[PDB]
Write a protein that binds this DNA or RNA. Structure first.
Lengths: 78, 97, 91, 104, 93, 108, 83, 98
DNA sequence: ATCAGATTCCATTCGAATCCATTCGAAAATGATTACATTCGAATCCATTCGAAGATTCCATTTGAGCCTGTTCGAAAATTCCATTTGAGTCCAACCAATGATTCCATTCATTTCCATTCAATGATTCCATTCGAATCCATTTGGAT
DNA sequence: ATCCAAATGGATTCGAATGGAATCATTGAATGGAAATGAATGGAATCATTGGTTGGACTCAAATGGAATTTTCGAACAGGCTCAAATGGAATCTTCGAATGGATTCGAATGTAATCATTTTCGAATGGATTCGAATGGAATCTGAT
């Protein structure tokens, strides 16, 4: 599913970040870093869900996870 | 046949996306990616829709700031183009690696 | 059941600006902001009391907290309205 | 009869006093502290909402949307410091293009 | 004029791993900072945990989820071990 | 009456379970503290202490010295990958750095 | 006392040079030595303010090493050994 | 007569300092710089010796790590020499600036 | 630079629709009011503790000279990667049904909190013993020039 | 491929400051018998989440064509390395002076603990709305070429 993150979507993400020109090796390197990030969040998030003795990951779990990581997210309730 | 050169309508799509808040990554592919990454941690898990949305906001935001720092690295090397080497310098200085 | 800052974000919104109303997702952002800053201030306050071995949080600790958390001019306006609000409370 | 009106605030001093007790910050909470805090919260809320509304109809929209909040936060230098490590959902970024990359 | 330290316990554990070796007072100091830092991280994360789930008490379950959150990888796994060991051994007599 | 011994012995720990419980009580972490928490925690602290002290003792006997000084402790942390993450944002007094020279700066 | 003036010049070119060595720098540009002093100054200010703020809240006139420790821990530089 | 070419006592002392823990900034100058920065923030202050020492350890650590990140910026731009441009890129990615 | 032709904003109305703001009967808190429990503003008195200075030794700091080599400028070659068409598909998106899973009670037992009352674990002091921080000196490099 | 000169370790040596034990206090675990909570334990409704299915629409993957940016490559300007002399002022020692901490008390003024009886904020629909998303007409800028 990591290939569901397309070449266009990575390009747009580079646009909003103000990048002129993309190496060909970037999209995979991009896809790498996202994965690490997306793992590290979910693990922590998933840990929160398991402590709660729940099987459904609440958006508050993701909020606590991100706050632990040091990427603080506003608008989802914390 | 009068049509555009290298790079400038790149700049043009840059200012227009920079002007919007729209989620750039296609949503459900991302959701599938969240679910597969998650099951490898624990199985039989479900996600609040808001939770997937939150993870997408965080994921694209992270990617945006990293592309900023990358581009600063590329320009710093006198080149104009982002290379894996730039992403890696960005993330090593950031203390992520 | 259960809580939000929305009614207060709204009151303050149109006391400063009679212009506008507030949308639900923007109201969310304002809520996450209030909550975040609350947590920062009170944590720094509790650390302060602890470092000095005092068992109670006073306006003095909230003040030193704000000087630590808030940058520069934002901090001084915050210390200001803090001491104002407290003094008018004693009346 | 409120403590919030007796302090002249819209923010709820009483609630802040409860949260200070139920947040495990210290065994006791002075009577002046929730007032000073609710105050600093009201001010910070207020300064934000001001910059946000102006950002709101400088695009001539009768409502403050998270985009407006992000413009407000990221343009004011001191707020940008306070919130540097926060991400605002639906925020976007500021339009910025490094010069070296502009035409001619 | 007398203060707490972890020095004796750091010291004992020192004589378990390396019975031949010493520890300098400044090196012992760094170790005290280490114990106290990690104590604070563990207990803070546990406190957040209990609060997010609306419970009034930090239990070994909280300390453990804390440890899984704070500690990286294999370090975390070995810590959960020595912990749950010590707790079961405690609950019996 | 009956003769006590410590809770540190009943879990078989060198670390002071009682003290850890006291600090958990006096630190405003929660209104009450389960009896298992100071035990698990004193375990994690004693374990981490122990792992550090081994890796440092090794750096000390690789440098031909019978006593652990902060330099060794810095060596121990910065070579072991996971300790290096755990302490990423920590600075060790009198720690030194790790010897490292980028490839490109070496004679050609 | 005496008047304190221009002590950022007590951070010499040699000392900045050693600091670049232990950090693994082969060659140092000439414009660095002042820029170093630029950033050092900033750093040492932001800590000391926080340090002094702790010292003031304690209602003390003497800055303790623990005030520097709390200060740095606030900054996100945690320092061991002076506790 | 002698002696060694450009680059040789560079690498020699990099090895020299990386092997030690000594504080590289001279002690008493650094002490003044602290008393000056502190006094012109607040006056009639006193300093525990330990508190200055703590400040100096923290400052030297901070600076050395920043020189690392800097040298990687030079090497990324293909040079061998740290430039102010490097220091400012280092501190910008570090979140200390824009 | 204008000429002088495609796109592409870029605004000024247009018609729907997805929401904000307002009104509305209850949980859920907030405020009072005695009446405790206690925290730490007020206050001497003892002692670390820093602060300042004065002196001499020599350790590095400073300053300037020559020159080797990396930084930059430029020009050329190589290629990676921009733009667009076409065509194929996988993303939206709409309810739409059913059922796991959260979630609110409401008992009882088990656990955790008190509060004195002794019993060890512990935490400064002297009181000695021992790593090791400074010295010399040989031997092994290790560079840079014939 | 080789000779010179420091330089590089690192072996051995002798003062000494820095350990690491022993001895008394005493602060603080630990004990133990009641006093509150808390955590399931089953026990039940309402949710949100998954789940398919089945239309249209962008949205996406390749393939080509060449316009520019990256690497290369080579000169040349030059900034920073490397060296040695000149002495400054850092490091070190030891001493006192008294401002300011920091243990010990002893007390009003403050915050807490209930416990009711009002007040409030949440909820959740219902009646104006503000904006999304089209539609062009014209700058607006981009462009191959006079």
């Amino acid at each position: 599913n990591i290939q569901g993150i397309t070449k266009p979507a990575i390009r747009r993400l580079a646009r909003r970040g103000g990048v002129k020109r993309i190496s060909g090796l970037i999209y995979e390197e991009t896809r790498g870093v996202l994965k690490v990030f997306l793992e590290n969040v979910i693990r922590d998030a998933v840990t929160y869900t398991e402590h709660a003795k729940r099987k459904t990951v609440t958006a508050m779990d993701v909020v606590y996870a991100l706050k632990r990581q040091g990427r603080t997210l506003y608008g989802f309730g914390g | 046949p009068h049509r555009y050169r290298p790079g400038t309508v790149a700049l043009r799509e840059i200012r227009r996306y920079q002007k919007s808040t729209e989620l750039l990554i296609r949503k459900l592919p991302f959701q599938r990616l969240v679910r597969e990454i998650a099951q490898d941690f624990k199985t039989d898990l479900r996600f609040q829709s808001s939770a997937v949305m939150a993870l997408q906001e965080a994921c694209e935001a992270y990617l945006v700031g990293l592309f900023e720092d990358t581009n600063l690295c590329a320009i710093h090397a006198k080149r104009v183009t982002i290379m894996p080497k730039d992403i890696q310098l960005a993330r090593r200085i950031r203390g992520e690696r | 059941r259960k809580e939000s800052y929305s009614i207060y974000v709204y009151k303050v919104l149109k006391q400063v600006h009679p212009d506008t109303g507030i949308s639900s997702k923007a109201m969310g952002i304002m809520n996450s902001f209030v909550n975040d800053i609350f947590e920062r201030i009170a944590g720094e306050a509790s650390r302060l009391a602890h470092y000095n071995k005092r068992s109670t949080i006073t306006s003095r600790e909230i003040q030193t907290a704000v000087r630590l958390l808030l940058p520069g001019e934002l901090a001084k306006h915050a210390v200001s309205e803090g001491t104002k609000a407290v003094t008018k409370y004693t009346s | 009869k409120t403590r919030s009106s007796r302090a002249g605030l819209q923010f709820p001093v009483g609630r802040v006093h409860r949260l200070l007790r139920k947040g495990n910050y210290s065994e006791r909470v002075g009577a002046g502290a929730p007032v000073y805090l609710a105050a600093v919260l009201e001010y910070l809320t207020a300064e934000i909402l001001e910059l946000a509304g102006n950002a709101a109809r400088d695009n001539k929209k009768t409502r403050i949307i998270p985009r407006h909040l992000q413009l407000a936060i990221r343009n004011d230098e001191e707020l940008n410091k306070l919130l540097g490590r926060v991400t605002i959902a639906q925020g976007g970024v500021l339009p910025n293009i490094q010069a070296v990359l502009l035409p001619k």
